[PDB]
């Protein structure tokens, strides 16, 4: 019965909020990465190679 949110306006709504939902996810990611010191993900970043090898 979630057919209430299915139409052109809602489709326009979703798009208007995508760059924002996408940028919020970049915030969440880097934020998770930097806070746990994600070895796997971090080692690829040019500077911040404070784990030598």
């Amino acid at each position: 019965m979630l057919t209430r949110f299915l139409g052109p306006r809602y489709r326009q709504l979703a798009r208007n909020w995508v760059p924002t939902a996408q940028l919020w996810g970049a915030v969440g990611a880097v934020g998770l990465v930097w806070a746990t010191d994600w070895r796997l993900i971090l080692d690829w970043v040019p500077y911040i190679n404070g784990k030598f090898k």
């Binding site: 209430r4 139409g7 052109p8």
Partner: protein
């Protein structure tokens, strides 16, 4: 019309009797769960029905409290069971659904 319809009708009558709201003088519509659509339909009821509905609920809550039940002759009989709320509820839903269609475009 025939054998089959009466059989579905008697199954419905059977559930009704088993459901047991009748035993507390309640009508089916007195047992409906109150969401917004319903809260509005109650609001839209005319004076008489509204008053009758409160007395029924009160009569039942009272019975339900002392865990008693009405004498058999005062149970509400199936299909003498006026669905007073239905037309109001239907229209309130119809109104909401139209709002909802407009909200999509």
């Amino acid at each position: 019309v025939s054998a089959s319809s009466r059989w579905l009708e008697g199954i419905r009558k059977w559930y009704y009797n088993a459901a047991g709201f009748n035993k507390l003088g309640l009508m089916r519509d007195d047992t409906i769960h109150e969401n917004d659509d319903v809260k509005e339909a109650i609001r839209r009821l005319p004076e008489n029905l509204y008053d009758d509905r409160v007395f029924r609920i009160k009569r039942a809550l009272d019975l339900s409290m002392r865990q008693q039940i009405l004498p058999k002759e005062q149970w509400t009989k199936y299909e003498e069971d006026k669905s007073y709320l239905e037309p109001y509820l239907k229209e309130v839903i119809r109104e909401r659904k139209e709002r909802e269609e407009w909200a999509k475009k």
